[PDB]
């Protein structure tokens, strides 16, 4: 089975009233459902005795309540380990202090397991359902560490990693010196954090920072420590600041990974992609960096190795739009469609950015017959479009001279939450009323203009004075005339005076042609009366046209004389 | 002035399907017909209503005993009840000169038939029946009384008795519906041959809960075997043996055929009855057509439908009631 | 028992006793009559005694662009909610109590002389 193009994603309720009608509702509908799951789990965990009857065979461990409270109330080492597994930072510290004051022996493995908990969360309690630098100067972690009787390599390593995680870059480098003074050897994970601290500790020029890192890496070789994927990913992630200076050094890291035997992941190229994709002219370098990155990744299935693997596709597409290369965009999307690579797209914000830049590039550089196939395949199946893609789509229909689809784009635009977008309704009306068309098309454009008019009339900003742009009023009126709905056009003329919007010259001339056909002098005067209010120069010349064209009754002649008096 | 509570809700009334509605209902049926053909992987062009019914029964299996309550995807013409069209125009003038009778279609027919009877005067069964009132009420698309139906038929019969011509015969035939009569002729079992080449016929019979299957040989000496046993050993009761005699005696063929039959279920009498019917049906293959019709008229080829009646709750038996307690 | 509870319709049909030999022939008269009351009228889905604030049900789902978390009203903040709902219940009853009186006819208990308004508009857009 393949994706159903007429349907919204499977997570949503398949019902026209419950289906999301916009990108905002697409996000908010899932958050409301997830909130209910949290409320249910909160109740299940708050009143577990109601949910303890296990009638399932085989037993389902994942459908039983969770118990987050310690069940050992004795003061001993084996009771502390329980509060460490539950990640009780305060209870574990209190239990450790009391245990220490009593004079009982607490093992080293357990003392370290307490630091891993404090050093990771920073002596703070993890978030629960319901009851700058963050390395607090007064922190239980540093105190317990000092009081510690015997300290091994693992104790220092967890202290160095926690400091860097909480942005205590300067303290972590100071602690790395003691580890060396004590003839100890750090691990790769500690080194990964020290590389991050070397770059973020102080602001200096690239050459100074690039010399320290190479000193850490050489130190990593002296201690017989082998670098892992995150070692190189941290170097490239940290070189983002220097940009142009780090472009060639960054490519030296990639060539080193291949030789050593570590395999670049999607994150390894995401960081390289972001580093080379600096504001400027990307053609000089970014062109051949992305072309070579995709030839390497061609036909490769990816596995999760780095936390930033779900950012490559969002990063790669961003360059394809900038370069305006559609052949490259298909290769990026082709890589996303091989095997299970579609799961690396990222969260909803990353999915909508990738598809917005992707589809907007299709409308621009792709044939309109193919563009309308992608429009059906992606929307609303893959993502709900932003109003700026609807405009990019209309601009594509215009360039292709296929305007019979405009009434469809308005119908879909409403179904995607763009009924009341001003930039969109103005664009639709301008294209529809730009030039005259055969009677069949002109009638269709007038049925849409009526529906758009209704949107202007029934806005949800109706509490505020209705904003009727000048272009919208001129276009809507012109479309009624060209369609033969003159009665509707004549009625709208009042709205030019009510909102004080200047009538367009083209609209006034077409109104005269509708009058000369109906041979109605009063309406023809009503036109000259309107242009006279705004003091348009064409009016004085139009008054001459009205005289000759239409029979002027004595009352009408005096009325023109009254406007002539104004002239 | 003041307000009285409104009597009822206008939605609480019968609906009507305008011609525009049916026109769009047909467009949905044609589009859905192509979808259904696509679902089943069949050619949409040659997709018939019989295929639709088969596909709908598979996709939407319903075991409801009443077929009218089961899923149905039929053409709107069949589904929606036929609607009489407007009987006047925009100016309000009715189209038919008998509009104000309220039965313009019925009285227009009576007027046409009465006029034909006049022109004749100025000029001068087994396979057919008269249509029923419910069929006349559909030809006219009007509601008709019982006496209205009679008056129309009395007028057509009065038209047949006259010297009606060809024009007056196509008319009456519009209201004559062919009546199909089932043939009471007994079906004759085929004559088969065994390994040794002896001709025989085979049939089956049911009496109460007893079921019998008899093999009657074209030639024999009068031997009857029941479950491998001599008939007089299997049926020690003289009446059960008389039942076996009845078919052969009735056609004067005692001592001319050999029979091997098997019977299960029921009691001794029900088994003899089931064998009687089984032998009679198979025996019809070796007698003349006139003899088979005489057996039918003698009750020898009819399955007895008399079976045990269920007991009902609240009474002693199938019919007996509990004693009406003394008052 | 939870399984012995019935729906509001079943309970009111019983309590009101509108069908029965009393109501068939008006054998029972009603100076004091049980009046049906809709108890789901002023009730908001998600609102309970404990005063919990469920994001997406009784409070907004997102606040300041971020998803709200489970919260509970303070004891004081919940008393106000309870008090406010009780007042709203008397206000609702007071609004129903305020019904416009109609003028009497020839006498206080007589129907004669009372206006019934204009006749209903006929089927063919006729008005009186």
């Amino acid at each position: 089975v393949n994706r159903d193009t007429t349907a919204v994603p499977y997570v949503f309720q398949d019902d026209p009233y419950l289906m999301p009608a916009s990108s905002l509702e697409s996000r908010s509908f899932l958050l409301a459902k997830k909130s209910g799951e949290n409320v249910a789990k909160f109740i299940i965990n708050s009143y577990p005795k109601y949910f303890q009857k296990d009638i399932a065979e085989p037993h389902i461990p994942c459908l039983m309540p969770e118990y987050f409270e310690p069940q050992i109330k004795d003061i001993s080492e084996a009771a502390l380990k329980e509060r460490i597994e539950l990640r009780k930072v305060k209870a574990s510290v209190d239990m450790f202090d009391q245990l220490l004051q009593a004079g009982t022996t607490v093992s080293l493995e357990t003392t370290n397991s307490l630091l891993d908990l404090l050093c990771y969360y920073g002596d703070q309690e993890p978030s629960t359902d319901y009851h700058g630098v963050t390395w607090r100067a007064k922190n239980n972690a540093e105190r317990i560490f000092s009081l510690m009787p015997e300290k091994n390599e693992h104790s220092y390593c967890t202290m160095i990693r926690g400091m860097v995680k909480h942005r205590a870059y300067e303290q972590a480098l100071n602690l790395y010196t003691e580890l060396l003074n004590n003839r100890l050897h750090a691990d790769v994970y500690t080194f990964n954090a020290l590389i991050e601290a070397t770059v973020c500790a102080i602001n200096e020029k690239f050459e100074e920072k690039w010399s320290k890192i190479l000193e850490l890496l050489r130190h990593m070789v002296a201690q017989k420590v082998k670098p892992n994927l995150q070692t190189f990913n941290t170097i490239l992630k940290c070189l983002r600041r220097f940009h142009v200076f780090a472009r060639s050094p960054a490519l030296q890291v990639l060539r080193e990974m291949k030789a050593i035997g570590i395999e670049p992941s999607l994150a390894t190229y995401h960081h390289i992609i972001r580093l080379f994709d600096q504001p400027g002219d990307p053609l000089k370098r970014s062109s051949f960096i992305i072309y070579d990155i995709m030839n390497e990744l061609m036909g490769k299935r990816f596995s999760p190795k780095d936390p930033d693997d779900d950012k490559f596709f969002q990063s790669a597409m961003s360059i394809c739009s900038s370069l305006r290369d559609l052949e490259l965009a298909y290769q990026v999307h082709g890589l996303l469609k091989t095997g299970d690579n579609w799961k690396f797209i990222g969260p909803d914000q990353h999915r909508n950015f990738y598809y917005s830049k992707f589809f907007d590039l299709i409308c621009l550089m792709e044939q309109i017959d193919v563009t309308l196939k992608w429009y059906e395949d992606l929307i609303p199946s893959a993502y709900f479009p932003h109003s700026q893609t609807m405009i990019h789509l209309l601009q594509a229909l215009d360039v292709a001279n296929r305007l019979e689809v405009i009434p469809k784009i308005w119908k879909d635009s409403k179904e995607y939450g763009h009924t009341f977008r001003s930039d969109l309704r103005e664009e639709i009306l301008m294209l529809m009323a730009r030039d005259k068309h055969p009677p069949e098309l002109q009638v269709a454009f007038a049925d849409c203009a009526a529906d758009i008019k209704s949107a202007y009339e029934s806005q949800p900003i109706r509490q505020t004075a209705q904003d009727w742009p000048a272009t919208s009023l001129n276009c809507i009126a012109i479309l009624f005339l060209r369609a033969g709905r003159t009665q509707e056009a004549w009625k709208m003329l009042g709205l030019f005076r009510k909102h004080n919007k200047i009538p367009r010259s083209e609209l006034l001339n077409e109104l005269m042609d509708s009058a000369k056909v109906s041979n109605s002098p009063s309406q023809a005067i009503e036109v000259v009366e309107l242009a006279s209010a705004f003091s348009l120069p064409i009016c004085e010349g139009l008054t001459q046209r009205v005289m000759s064209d239409f029979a002027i009754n004595q009352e009408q002649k005096e009325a023109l004389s009254n406007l002539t008096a104004l002239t | 002035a003041f307000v009285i509570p409104k009597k009822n809700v206008p939605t609480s009334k019968r609906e009507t399907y305008t011609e525009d509605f049916i026109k769009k209902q047909i467009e949905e049926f044609n589009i859905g017909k192509r979808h259904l053909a696509n679902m089943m992987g069949e050619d949409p062009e040659t997709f018939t209503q019989e295929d639709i019914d088969r596909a709908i029964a598979y996709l939407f299996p319903s075991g409801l005993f009443e077929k009218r309550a089961r899923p149905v995807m039929k053409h709107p013409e069949q589904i929606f009840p036929r609607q009489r069209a407007i009987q006047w125009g925009e100016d309000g003038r009715p189209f038919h000169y008998l509009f104000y009778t309220g039965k313009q279609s019925y009285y227009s027919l009576m007027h046409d038939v009465y006029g034909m009877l006049l022109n004749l005067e100025k000029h001068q069964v087994i396979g057919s029946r008269w249509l029923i009132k419910e069929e006349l009420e559909e030809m006219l698309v009007e509601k008709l009384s019982d006496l209205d139906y009679m008056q129309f038929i009395r007028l057509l019969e009065k038209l047949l008795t006259s010297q009606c011509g060809a024009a007056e015969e196509e008319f009456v035939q519009r209201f004559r519906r062919s009546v199909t009569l089932e043939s009471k002729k007994q079906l004759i079992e085929p004559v088969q041959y065994d390994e040794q080449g002896m001709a025989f016929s085979k049939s089956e019979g049911k009496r109460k809960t007893a079921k019998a299957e008899a093999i009657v040989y074209k030639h024999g000496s009068g031997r009857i075997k029941v479950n491998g046993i001599d008939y007089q050993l299997y049926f020690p009761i003289t009446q059960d043996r008389e039942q076996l005699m009845f078919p052969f005696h009735f056609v004067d063929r005692l001592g001319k055929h050999d029979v091997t039959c098997t019977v299960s279920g029921g009691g001794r009498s029900a088994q003899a009855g089931a064998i009687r019917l089984a032998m009679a049906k198979a025996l019809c293959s070796f007698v003349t057509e006139d003899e088979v019709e005489w057996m039918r008229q003698a009750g020898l080829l009819t399955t007895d439908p008399r079976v045990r009646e269920r007991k009902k709750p609240g009474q002693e038996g199938a019919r007996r009631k509990f004693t009406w307690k003394k008052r | 028992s939870f399984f012995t509870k019935l729906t509001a319709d079943e309970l009111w049909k019983g309590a009101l006793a509108e069908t029965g030999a009393g109501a068939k022939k008006g054998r029972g008269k009603r100076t004091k009559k049980k009046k049906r009351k809709d108890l789901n009228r002023g009730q908001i889905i998600g609102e309970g005694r404990y005063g919990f604030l469920w994001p997406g049900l009784n409070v907004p789902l997102m606040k300041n662009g971020a998803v709200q978390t489970i919260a509970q009203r303070s004891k004081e903040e919940q008393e106000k909610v309870e008090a406010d709902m009780i007042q709203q219940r008397e206000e609702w009853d007071r609004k129903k109590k305020m019904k416009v009186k109609r003028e009497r006819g020839w006498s206080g208990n007589s129907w004669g002389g009372i206006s019934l308004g204009p006749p209903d508009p006929g089927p063919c857009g006729e008005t009186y």
């Binding site: 009608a21 916009s22 905002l24 509702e25 409403k414 179904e415 995607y416 939450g417 009924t419 029934s458 949800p460 | 307000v3 509570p5 | 129903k96 305020m98 019904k99 416009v100 009186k101 109609r102 003028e103 009497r104 206080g108 009372i114």
Partner: peptide, 16 residues
């Protein structure tokens, strides 16, 4: 009766 008898639109996709 004389006491009184007082028993007492637009749609949008993605409304707000």
């Amino acid at each position: 009766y004389l006491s009184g008898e007082e028993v007492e639109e637009y749609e949008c996709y993605a409304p707000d």
